[PDB]
Every structure is written in C-alpha cells, then in structure tokens.
Design a protein around this ligand. Structure first.
Ligand SMILES: N[C@@H]1[C@@H](O)[C@H](O)[C@@H](CO)O[C@H]1O
Ligand SMILES: N[C@@H]1[C@@H](O)[C@H](O)[C@@H](CO)O[C@H]1O
Ligand SMILES: N[C@@H]1[C@@H](O)[C@H](O)[C@@H](CO)O[C@H]1O
Length: 364
C-alpha cells in the first residue's frame, strides 16, 4: 500500500534526550506536553530521533528502542511515535545514524590519511563513523534498523548527515580494498591527486554511501511495508557548490533521485555565514535549487533554530529570526521547509510566533 503526503511539507526535527527523564512520572508529563506541542503547531511531519545523544560527541552508544546490539536507554521511540501519528496529526520519520554507531571495536572505522603521515587515523572533529566498506558494519547496522522496524510503526526514515566522507577518506584497509577492486590505481594519495581518477573516486564514494542507505531502507520496507518514505540530510555545500562532493561524498542530483525527500541543512550560521549575509545566502541557495527542474518539489529546507558553538554551549536563534527565514523562503518560492532543533521545555521556538510562517492551517 501507498501513503500520500499533503503539500507542502512542514517539518519539526525533534530530539528525545530531554523528553527522557529518569523519573517515569516526569517523563510521562514531558511526552504529553510534546504531543500537545506538535498538535498545536499544526504542521505535516516530525523527524523523530531514534537514538540517544546525551553528550553530542558524535557517537551513538544507546538508543530509544529495544534491539540486539546496543543498550536501550528507554523504550520511548514507539511510544512517542504512535501518539504523534494519531493525536498530533503528523507523519513520523525515524531519524537514524547511518554510520556513527558504538559497535564492536573490531568493526572497521572510517579513517583519514593525514598529510605527511603514513598511517591512517580517526579525524577528531568529525562523526565517529563506521566504514561502509566493511561488510560486517553493513550487516550490524542492518540489524539495528531491522530491530527498529520490528518494534515500532512509523511513516519514513531520515538518514543522518553522518553519511559523509572527505577527500582524505575513507583510508581504512577495507576501503582501500574496495577502491582497488573498483579499478582505482594506487594509494589513496595517488588516487586523490590523479586528474583522471579523483572525480570518479569521489562519485564512487558518494554512490557507496547512497547504496548503503538504500540497503537499509529496503530492510525496513521488508518489515514495515513499501509505503515507508525516505529522507536524507544533505549538507548545503554539495548543493550550492557541487565540486564540494569531492570532500563530502554527497551529490544533490543523486539524493533527488534516490530518496523521497532531500533534507537540505539550510543553515547559514553553521556554514560560517555572517548574520548580515544570511538572507542572501539562503536566497542564493533557493536560486540554485529552483534552477534544477523539480528539485524544490523533492527537497526540504531545514533551517537551524540554534547556533552551535565549538565549546558546546549552543546559542539560541530567536523565534523572530526563524519566522523571518521561513517567510524569506516562502517569498522566494520555496514551500517545503522545517527546522532543527526543537525545545518543548522552553517553548523554543515559540509556537505562537512561528505558526504564522510555518503552519498552512494558520489564520489571522
Ligand atoms: N576546500 C577545502 C578542500 O580544498 C580540501 O581538500 C578539503 C579537505 O578536507 O577541505 C575543504 O575545506
Ligand atoms: N561542520 C560542518 C562540516 O562538515 C563542514 O566542514 C562545513 C563546511 O561546509 O559544513 C558544516 O556543516
Ligand atoms: N553540528 C552538529 C551536528 O550534529 C550536525 O551536523 C548538525 C545537525 O543539524 O548540527 C549539529 O547538531
């Protein structure tokens, strides 16, 4: 069976880390408040965190659903999902990491080759990703997605933005083997700097990530049904500067063909854009999108509602600023959009302030 999605898409991207409370009665009230908040927002879709992320340290150690391989911090994904689907009027996408799982140490990790060093290493300021070139990684991540699919009912999958590789990655042994078997000549350095192979190499890696996600969605669809929608977060640079695929292994046209929804992280401050230049940056982004026929109809522009800091103390973005950006998108012909993150505990962003620009059901 199939499942239609009413135009336009308006998305809340929601973490469960602060919904969780070790006091069961408090967690009950938290969930009730969250369900009511999404209901009142009157939008179309929630991208719902299925994994725990208490530290923001780029590695999933625990999840919100029972499963074979990782600790379950609390059984709350299915509980929140079915109530959002029936009380709050939204489709639910299970938001899952693709690679950043704290599994068996013998499983291959993604590594990069540091300039001037012989041995590959793990990049300190990147997601702690397992290698998609390790068959056992593919198997075990497959088991996690199947465990999710078997325990919970939902409408789609959002594949995490951790499915990325730089131009010095993946330097792990299984990755080297894969390149060699795919006909690439020499070391990673020689490939990376080979005029006749470096672009083909970037595309090989982009496709390997994409094919891996499609393996996962097939496994979920086998259990839940064919109606399950797919979405994947894409970084903005591969959209506005496609040569940057070389150090993201993400390709916008590929996403548009492969997934139901391409969730662009339309986040200027994340990309280092000055406050006074953010609107123009977003305008340029929408221009690039509109220049690709039908791209906007399969893309979601995900705005940021926090300004993340290296030292961990993230700075909020005002509801006014967020509503302003939503209006900017609308006025530039983009109707599918959303934001991350949400904070029910402080009504941030403020329901009453963003609904006019966010909810299609809103009236004066
Ligand atoms: N523009 C640079 C690339 O030139 C470089 O190769 C890459 C390395 O990861 O990072 C980018 O910021
Ligand atoms: N912090 C990420 C990096 O992955 C990347 O270096 C940067 C440049 O595009 O975009 C950000 O979202
Ligand atoms: N910089 C972090 C990353 O986890 C991610 O790339 C992005 C998601 O929206 O923003 C923050 O959460």
């Amino acid at each position: 069976g199939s499942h239609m999605e009413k135009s336009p898409q308006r998305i809340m991207h929601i973490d469960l880390d602060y919904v969780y409370d070790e006091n069961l009665q408090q967690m009950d009230r938290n969930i009730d408040v969250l369900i009511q908040r999404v209901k009142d927002m009157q939008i179309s879709t929630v991208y719902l965190q299925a994994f725990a992320d208490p530290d923001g340290d780029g590695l999933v150690k625990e999840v919100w659903f029972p499963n074979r391989l990782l600790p379950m911090k609390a059984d709350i994904f299915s509980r929140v999902a079915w109530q959002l689907r029936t009380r709050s009027g939204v489709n639910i996408y299970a938001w899952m990491p693709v690679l950043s799982w704290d599994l068996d140490p013998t499983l291959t990790r993604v590594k990069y080759l540091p300039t001037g060093e012989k041995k590959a290493q793990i990049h300190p300021e990147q997601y702690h990703r397992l290698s998609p070139f390790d068959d056992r990684v593919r198997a075990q991540v497959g088991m996690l997605y199947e465990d999710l699919a078997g325990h919970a009912a939902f409408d789609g999958i959002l594949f995490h933005d951790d499915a990325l590789l730089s131009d010095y990655e993946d330097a792990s042994a299984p990755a080297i083997t894969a390149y060699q078997q795919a006909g690439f000549s020499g070391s990673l350095s020689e490939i990376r700097q080979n005029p006749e192979q470096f672009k083909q190499w970037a595309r090989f890696k982009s496709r390997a990530l994409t094919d891996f996600t499609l393996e996962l969605s097939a496994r979920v669809k086998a259990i839940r049904g064919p109606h399950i929608k797919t979405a994947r977060n894409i970084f903005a640079l591969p959209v506005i500067q496609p040569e940057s695929e070389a150090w993201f292994a993400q390709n916008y046209a590929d996403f548009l063909k492969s997934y139901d929804w391409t969730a662009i992280m339309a986040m200027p401050y994340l990309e280092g854009v000055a406050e006074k230049s953010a609107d123009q940056w977003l305008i340029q982004l929408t221009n690039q999108i509109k220049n690709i026929p039908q791209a906007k109809d399969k893309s979601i522009l995900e705005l940021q509602a926090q300004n993340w800091q290296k030292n961990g103390q993230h700075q909020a973005i005002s509801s006014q600023q967020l509503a302003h950006w939503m209006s900017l998108l609308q006025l530039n012909g983009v109707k599918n959009y959303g934001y991350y993150p949400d904070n029910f505990l402080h009504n941030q962003p403020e329901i009453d302030l963003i609904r006019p620009e966010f909810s299609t059901a809103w009236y004066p």
